[PDB]
Paper text:
MT-associated protein 7 (MAP7) has the unusual ability of both MT binding and activating kinesin-1-mediated cargo transport along MTs. The interaction of MAP7 with MTs is mediated by its 112 residues long MT binding domain (MTBD) (residue 59–170). Microtubules (MTs) are key components of the eukaryotic cytoskeleton and are essential for intracellular organization, organelle trafficking and mitosis. MT-associated proteins (MAPs) interact with MTs, regulate their dynamics, and mediate MT functions in physiological contexts through sophisticated regulation.
To improve the occupancy of MAP7 MTBD on the MT lattice, additional MAP7 MTBD was therefore added to MAP7 MTBD-nucleated MTs adsorbed on the grid before vitrification. Following imaging and processing of these MTs, the symmetrized 3D reconstruction of MAP7 MTBD bound MT had an overall resolution of 3.3 Å and revealed improved MAP7 MTBD density lying along the protofilament, and offset ~20 Å from its centre. α- and β-tubulin were accurately discriminated during data processing, as evidenced by the distinct appearances of their S9-S10 luminal loops. The helical nature of MAP7 MTBD is also evident from the reconstruction density, albeit at slightly lower local resolution (~4 Å) compared to the MT. Individual MAP7 MTBD side chains however, could not be discriminated in the helical density, probably due to a number of factors including sub-stoichiometric MT binding and as a result of the dynamic nature of the MT-MTBD interaction. To facilitate interpretation of our reconstruction, we used AlphaFold 2 multimer to predict the structure of MAP7 MTBD (residues 59–170) bound to a tubulin dimer. The calculated model was fit into the MAP7 MTBD-MT cryo-EM density, and flanking tubulin monomers along the full length of the MTBD were also incorporated for refinement against the electron density map. However, since the exact register of the MAP7 MTBD cannot be confirmed based on cryo-EM density alone, we truncated our MAP7 MTBD to include only its helical backbone together with 4 tubulin monomers, including the central α/β-tubulin dimer18. Additional C-terminal residues Val437-Val440 for α-tubulin and residues Ala428-Ala430 for β-tubulin were therefore also modelled guided by the density. The ordering of these usually disordered residues could be a result of an interaction between the tubulin CTTs and MAP7; however, this interaction is not directly visible in our reconstruction and is presumably not well ordered. MAP7 MTBD forms a 130 Å long helix from around residue R66 to residue E148 and binds MTs along the protofilament as confirmed by cryo-EM.
Numbering used by the authors:
A (entry chain B), B (entry chain D): 1 to 430
C (entry chain A), D (entry chain C): 1 to 37, 47 to 440
Amino acid sequence: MREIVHIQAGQCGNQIGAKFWEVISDEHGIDPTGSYHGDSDLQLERINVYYNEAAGNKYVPRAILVDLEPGTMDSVRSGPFGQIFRPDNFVFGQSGAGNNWAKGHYTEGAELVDSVLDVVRKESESCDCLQGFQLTHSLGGGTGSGMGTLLISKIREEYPDRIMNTFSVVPSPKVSDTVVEPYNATLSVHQLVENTDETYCIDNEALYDICFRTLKLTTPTYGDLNHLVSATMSGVTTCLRFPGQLNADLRKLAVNMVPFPRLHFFMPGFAPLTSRGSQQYRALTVPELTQQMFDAKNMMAACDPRHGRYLTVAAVFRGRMSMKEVDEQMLNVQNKNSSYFVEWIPNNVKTAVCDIPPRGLKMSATFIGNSTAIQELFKRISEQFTAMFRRKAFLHWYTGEGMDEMEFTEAESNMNDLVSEYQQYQDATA
Amino acid sequence: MREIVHIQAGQCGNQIGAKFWEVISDEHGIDPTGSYHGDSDLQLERINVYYNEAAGNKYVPRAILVDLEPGTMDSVRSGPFGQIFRPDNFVFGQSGAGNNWAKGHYTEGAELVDSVLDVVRKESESCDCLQGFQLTHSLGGGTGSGMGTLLISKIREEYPDRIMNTFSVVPSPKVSDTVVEPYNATLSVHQLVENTDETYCIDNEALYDICFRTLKLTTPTYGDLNHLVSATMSGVTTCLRFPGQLNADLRKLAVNMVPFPRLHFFMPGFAPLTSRGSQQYRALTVPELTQQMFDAKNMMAACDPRHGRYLTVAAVFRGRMSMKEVDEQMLNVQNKNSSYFVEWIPNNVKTAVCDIPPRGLKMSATFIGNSTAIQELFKRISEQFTAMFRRKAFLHWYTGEGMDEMEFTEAESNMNDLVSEYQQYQDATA
Amino acid sequence: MRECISIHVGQAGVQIGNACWELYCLEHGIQPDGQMPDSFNTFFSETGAGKHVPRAVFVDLEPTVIDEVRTGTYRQLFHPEQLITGKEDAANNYARGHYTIGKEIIDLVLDRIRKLADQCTGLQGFLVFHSFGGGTGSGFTSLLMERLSVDYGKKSKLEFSIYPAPQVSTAVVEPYNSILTTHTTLEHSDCAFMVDNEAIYDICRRNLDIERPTYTNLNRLISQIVSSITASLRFDGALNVDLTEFQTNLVPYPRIHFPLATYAPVISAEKAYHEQLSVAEITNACFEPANQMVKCDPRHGKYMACCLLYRGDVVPKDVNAAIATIKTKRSIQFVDWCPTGFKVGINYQPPTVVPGGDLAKVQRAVCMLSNTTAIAEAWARLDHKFDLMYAKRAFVHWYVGEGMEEGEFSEAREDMAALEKDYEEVGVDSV
Amino acid sequence: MRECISIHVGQAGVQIGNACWELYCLEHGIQPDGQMPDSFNTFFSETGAGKHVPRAVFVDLEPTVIDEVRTGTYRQLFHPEQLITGKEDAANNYARGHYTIGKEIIDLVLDRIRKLADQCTGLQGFLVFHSFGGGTGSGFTSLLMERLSVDYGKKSKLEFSIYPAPQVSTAVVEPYNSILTTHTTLEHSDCAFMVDNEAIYDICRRNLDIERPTYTNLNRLISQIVSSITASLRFDGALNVDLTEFQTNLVPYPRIHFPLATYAPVISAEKAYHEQLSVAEITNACFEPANQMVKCDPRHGKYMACCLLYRGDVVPKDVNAAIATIKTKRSIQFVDWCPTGFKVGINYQPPTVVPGGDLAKVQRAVCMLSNTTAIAEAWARLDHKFDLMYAKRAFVHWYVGEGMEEGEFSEAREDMAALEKDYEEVGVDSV
Ligand SMILES: Nc1nc2c(ncn2[C@@H]2O[C@H](COP(=O)(O)OP(=O)(O)OP(=O)(O)O)[C@@H](O)[C@H]2O)c(=O)[nH]1
Ligand SMILES: Nc1nc2c(ncn2[C@@H]2O[C@H](COP(=O)(O)OP(=O)(O)OP(=O)(O)O)[C@@H](O)[C@H]2O)c(=O)[nH]1
Ligand SMILES: Nc1nc2c(ncn2[C@@H]2O[C@H](COP(=O)(O)OP(=O)(O)O)[C@@H](O)[C@H]2O)c(=O)[nH]1
Ligand SMILES: Nc1nc2c(ncn2[C@@H]2O[C@H](COP(=O)(O)OP(=O)(O)O)[C@@H](O)[C@H]2O)c(=O)[nH]1
Ligand SMILES: [Mg+2]
Ligand SMILES: [Mg+2]
C-alpha cells in the first residue's frame, strides 16, 4: 500500500541513488544479498513501500536506473549493492549525451525512453496503490537534465493523478563543472516548473561548506555529499515507512508546502550535523536540533535564507521526543525570526514526528524550506544564460540536434516570469 | 374500605417513594420478604389501605412506579425492598425525557401512559371504596413534570369524584439543579392548579437547612432528605391506618385546608426534629412540639412564613396525649401570633390526634400550613421564567416536540393570575 | 438497555479513542483479551460466551494508525470488521477527505454503523472523535455527520473536536479545514465539545509538573473527561444524567453548541498529599481562569450554562454550597437572562487511576462543561487567519482540483461571520 | 562498448603513436606479446584466445618509419594488415601527399578503418596524429579527414597536430603546408589539439633539467597528455567525461576548435622529493605562462574554455577551492560573455611511470586543455610567413607540377585571414 517507484537518471543521479539504496537497506536491515536480516519487524511492516517480495524471502528495490553511457551502470554493478537490483531494470544507451541537453532529450533519449517507460509501467501496475514517483537527477549535465525531463513529461502524461518528486542538484554559484551548465539548467527548469509537483534544490558549494565548516572534514569525497542527500531523502520519506505521533505523507507535504502551482522549489536541511570530535560537547535536544535546522549556513542550497522570507517551512522530526518541546521551539522560531516569514501566512510551520530515528542517532529532524531566497539562484542562472546567449556561444551544438532559438527564448522568458512571481510574492504584504 | 394507591413518577419521585415504602413497612412491621412479622395487632387492622393480601399471607403495596429510563428502576429493583413490589408494576420507558417537558408529556409519555392507566384500573378494581390517589412528584425534571402532569389529567378524567395528592419537589430559590427548571415548573403548575386537590410543595434548600441547623448533620445525603419527606407523608395518612382520640381523613383534610379551589398548595412540617446530641437535653412535651411546628425555619418550603398570613393550618399529632394540652397550645398560638392569621377566618387550626406514635418516638406531630407566603416562591419562578422567555432561550427544544409559544404565554397567565389571587386574600380585610 | 456508539475518525480521533477504550477496559475490569475475570452493557456487546466487544468504529484513510492499533496490546478486543482503513490519506486536503476519497469508504462505514445499531436497542446517541485541523478528521467527519443526520434524524450526535491552538499550529491549512468543517457540520451536530492542545500543554506543565508531555498524557486527560461525561450512563448514583439532558441544558440556541470541557482535580502525586481536595476547592479549581482546556480567557466573556458532573463520595449539600459561593462571585459573570446557571450531575463511582498515568488517585472528581461566550475570540482569530490566507487565494488550487468550487469558501466565510454575529448578539444584555 | 580508433599519419604521427601505445600497454599491463598476464575493451580488440590487439592504423607514404616498427620490440603486437605503407614519400609536397600519391593508398586505408568499425561497437570517435610541417602529415590527413566526414558524419574526430615552431624550423615549406591543410581541415575536424616543438623543448630543458632532449622524451610527454584525455574512458572514477563532452565544452563556435594542451606536474626525480605537489600547486602550474606546450603568451589573449582532467587521489573539494582561486586572479583574463569556463573531469587512476622516461612517479596529475585567443598571434605569424614566400611565388612550381591550381593558394590564404578575423571578433568584450 502506498508504494513509491524510484528512478535514477544521469551520472549524478546514479551516484546519489547508490548511497540512497545503501542507507535505505541499512534502515530496513536488508543485507547486500537482498535477504532480510534485521531485528525489528517494524522495518518489514512497511517494506512494501520500496521493495517487492520475491521467492526465498528475497527483496528487491523498486528502482529504475537510466543512463546513456554504460560506465556508470558498470560501476554500480560492481558496487556492494549491485546484486539487489533486478538486472532487467538496468536501461542504458550507447552514444551518451555528452553534456548536450538536446542530445539527451531528442536524439539519444528519444530512442531509449520506450524501454524506460515499459519498465515503469511494469513496476507500477505490479502495485496495488501507487503513491508517487521520485527522481534523482542533475540539472547541470546533459543526460540528467534531458532524459529526466523527458521522462517526467512522459510520466506526467501517463499518471496525471500521482506526484513526482525530483531531488535535482543545481549548479553551484562560484564553482562550475560544465560550460553549458546555464543552458542545461534553464532548459530543464522550463519543463520542471510545469511538470513536477515538488523539487528539492541541492548545491555542491553548500554541501562542501557543510562538510568542511560544520562536519570538520578535510577530504570530503562525493560519497559524503551523496550520503547527506540520501539521508535527507530518507528523512523526507520516513513518515510512510514507520509509525509516529504525527505521520505525514508525500502528498501531505505537497499540500502543506506549495501555496501556488509554480512555486515548488525547496531547500532541504538536516539537523544533527556534528563532527566526531564535538560529539560529547553538544547536548542532543530538541532546541539544539531546531537551532541547527534554521541556521543560515546549514542549508544545502547555495542561497542565503536571510535574503528572503520563507513561505512555508516543514520540519520532519525523527525519534521519540515530546510534542510540547517541538511546538514550543517552533513558536520561539516564529517569534524571534518573525521578520523572516510572510505576514499573509498566519502559521508557517508544518511538523511531522516519527518513532524511528535514523540508525545510530537518538533523535533527528529533517528541514524543508520554501524560501524566496531561491530567486537569487534563479536570477544568477538567468544572467549566465543571457551572457552566453547574447553571442550565441555553443548554440551550434544544440541547433545540430534539431533545436532552435525560439525554445531558448521561451525558456528564458519562463525563468524570468518565475523570478518575477517569486519577487512579487516576497514583496506583497497583507 | 378507604384504600389509597401510590404512584411514583420521575427519578426524584421513585427515590422518595423507596424511602416512603421503607418507612411504611417499618411502621406495619413488614419485612422485605413481604411477610408480616410485627407484634402489635393494630398494624394489620387497616393494612389493606396500602397493601393487597396474597397467597401465603404475602402483602404487596398498592404502588405503581413509572419512569422513562430504566436507570432508577434497576436501583429500586436491586434495593432493600426491590422484591416487595410486584414486578408487573415496574412500568418504564427507553428514550427518557431528558428534562424536556414536551418530550416527557407529548412524545415519550404518550406511548407509556396507556400501559400505566391499565395498571391503575387493575389496582383500583382490587378495592371496594377507593379513597384517593397519591403521587410522588418532581417539578424540576422532565419525566416527573411531564409524565406526572399528563398522568394526573387522565386519572382526574377517569375518577372525577376521588382526591389526588401530589408531593412535588419545588425548585430551590438559590441552588438550581437544571437550567430549564423555570420552564418545567411553570408548565406543570399550569395543570396541577386545575386538576389536583392537595399539593405539598417541598424545596431542597429548606431541607438542607433543617439537616444542618437542626439535625447538626455534616454529610446530609439524599437518603436523609427523602426520609424527612417520607415521614411527612406517613403522618398525613396515619389517621386512616390507625385509631385515635380524634381521627381525621384525607377528604376531611382537603375540606379544612382548601378555602377556594385555586388555593391548595401547602407547606408541610415535622415537629419532633432534634439532633442526636440534643436528645437528652430537650423535654418531649406538647408545648415543645407546638413551638417547633410554628418555627419559621422549620418549614420544608423555602418561603418565609413571617412574610404572609396563614389562611388555614392543620396539625396532625401522633401518640397518646391529652386533648386539653393540645387545645390550649393552639389557642396560645392563635392569640400570640394573631397578626399572622387572616381576620376573616374565625378559627384557623384543625387538629388531628392518633394514638400510635411513629416508630421509636414517644409522641410527634405533623404540620401542614396553607400560607399566602408561598406567593413569594411563585413570583420567583415567574421572574425566572420571564427572563429566559423574553430571549426565547432553549425554546427550540420544546417547540421541536410539538409545543408552541401559545402554551408558554398561557402558562404565565395562569401563574400571574394565581399570584394575584394569593395577594388578593392577603390584602383582603373583613 | 441504553446503547451508545463511539466513532473515531482521523489520527487524533483514533488515538484518543484508543486511550479512552483503554480507560474503559481498566474501569470495568475488562481484560484486553475481552474476557472479564449491567454496567458494561451501555458500551460493550457481550457477544459469545464470556467475551465483550466495544461498540466502536475506527475509520482512517491512512492505514498506519489503524495498523498500529491492530498490532497493539488491544489486538484481540475490537471486532476485525469494525476497523475500516482507506488506501490514501486525505493529506490535510478537506476536499480529498470529503469528496474524492470519502465517497469510497462512506458506504462501508454506514453499513457497519447500521449493523451496530440493529445489534442494539435504546440507542442514546453517537460519540465522534476528530481533529479540526487534519483532512480526514474534517472532511470525513462532515460527510459522516451528514449521512447520520439523514439516516438517524431522531438521535443525538456528540463531537470532541481538537480545536486549533491560538499560537501553536501544525498544519498550514488548519484555518481552511476548520472553517469548512464548521460550516458543513454546524447544522447537524447537537453538541460538540472542543479542546486545545496549547491549553492542555499549559495545564500539564503548570499542574502536573511535567516538562516533556507527549500525546499520551493529553489523550489520557481527554479520556478522563469523556469518562466523566459518560459515567452517569454506566453507574448508578444520585442525580443521574443522560446525553439528551446534555443537549437540553447546554444548548440555549441551535447554533451555540460549543461548550468547553474542563477537569478540576488535576494534580500530581507529589503535590496531592498537601491538599485536602475538598468539594469547594475542586469547584473553585474548575473555574480557574488558567485551568480551562481551551486557550480562551473566561473573564472576557459571559457564561451561559455550565454543567457539573461530579464523581466519587460527594455530598449534595457541599455541591449546593459551592454553587452558591460561585454565584456570589462578581468576576464570574453569567448572562442576566439565564438565572439558573448550573446543571448538576452526581455519581457514586470515583475516578480510576491509570496504571501508567501521571494523575494521582483522588477521592473526588468533577468535570465542567461550560457554554461560554468567550469562544467568540477564538472564532474571530481563526476567521481572521482564514481571511488573511484566502485574501490571495493561497493554498486553494489543491481544493479546486478535487471537485470543489471556490464559492464554497465564501459561503463558509459568510456562515462563520454569521455565527460570530450571533455570539455577539447573545452577549448583549437584556432590557 | 565505447571503442575508440586511433590513426597515425606521417612520420611524426607514427613515432608519437609508437610512444603512445608503449604507454597504454604499460598502463593496462598488456605485454609486448599482446598477451595480458573490461577496461581495455575501449582500445584493444580481444581477438583470439588470451591475446589483445590494439585498434590502430599506421599509414605513411615512406616505408622507412613503419619498417622500423615491424623490426621494433612491438612487432608482434600490431595486426600486420593494419600497417599500410606506400613506396614514395610525399617529400613535404602537399599535393603529392593529397593528390598524386594519396589517391593510390586512401582506398586501402578506408578498407581497414571500415573493418575495425564493423568489429567494434558503440564507436566513440577518431584520434589522428599528424604534422602540419610535413607533406604526408598534412596532405594525407586532409584527404583522410575529407573521406571520414562523408562516411562517418555522426562521429567526432580529434587531432593532435604538431604546430610549427615560431623560431625553430625544419622544412622551408612549413608555412605552405600548414595553411593548405588548415583550410581543408577546418570544416571537417571537430577539435584539434596543437603542440609546438619549441615550447616542449623549453619545458624539457627547464623543468626536467634535460641538457640534450630527443624526440623520445618529447613524444612521451605527448603520450601522457593523450593518456589523460582517454583516462575517463579506459578507467572509472568520480565525474567521468567522454569525447563527445570535449566537443561541446571546448568549441564555442564551429570555426574555433584549436585548444592548447598542458601537463602540470612535470618534474624530475631529483626535484620531486622537495616539492609538495599539492592540488593547488599543480593547478597553479597548469596556468604558468612558461609551462604551456605552445610557444604563445597566454597573457596576450583571453581564455574562452579550459578543461581540467585530474588524475589520481584528488578530492573534489580541493578542485573547487583551487578553481575559485584561479578565477580570482586579475591577470588570468576570461571572456566576459563566458561566465563559467571550466569543465572539470576527475579520474581515480594515477599516471604510470615509463621505465625509461624522465618523469618521476606522482600521486596526482592533471592535463589542461584550454581554448584561448592567444593563438591569434601564432596564426598571424604563419600567415605572415605564407605571404612573404608566395609574394615571390617561390616553390609554387613544385605544387603546380602535381595537379594543384594557383588560385587554391589564394583561397587558403583568404580563409586563413577570415579565421584570424574571427578570433579577433570573439576576443572583443560585450557592451
Ligand atoms: N490532543 C491530541 N491531538 C492530536 C493527536 N494526534 C493528532 N492530533 C491533532 O491532529 C491534528 C492533525 O490532524 P490529523 O488527525 O492528524 O489528520 P487526519 O485526520 O489523520 O487526516 P490527514 O491529514 O489526511 O492525515 C494535529 O494538529 C494535532 O493537533 C493526539 O494524539 N492528541
Ligand atoms: N614532437 C615530434 N615532432 C616530430 C617528430 N618527428 C618529426 N617531427 C616534426 O614533424 C614535422 C613533419 O615531419 P614529417 O612527419 O617527417 O613529415 P611527413 O608527414 O613524414 O611527410 P614527408 O615530408 O613526406 O616525410 C617535422 O618538421 C618535425 O619537426 C617526433 O618524433 N616528435
Ligand atoms: N553531489 C554529487 N554531484 C555529482 C556527483 N557526480 C556528478 N555530480 C554533478 O553532476 C554534474 C555532472 O553532470 P552529469 O550527470 O555527469 O552529466 P550527464 O551524464 O550528461 O547527465 C556536475 O555538475 C556534478 O556537480 C556525485 O557523486 N555527487
Ligand atoms: N429530595 C430529593 N430530590 C431529588 C432526588 N433526586 C432528584 N431530586 C430532585 O429532582 C430534580 C431532578 O429532576 P428529575 O426527576 O431527576 O428529572 P426527570 O427524571 O426527567 O423527571 C432535581 O432538581 C433534584 O432536586 C432525591 O433523591 N431526593
Ligand atoms: Mg491521517
Ligand atoms: Mg615522411
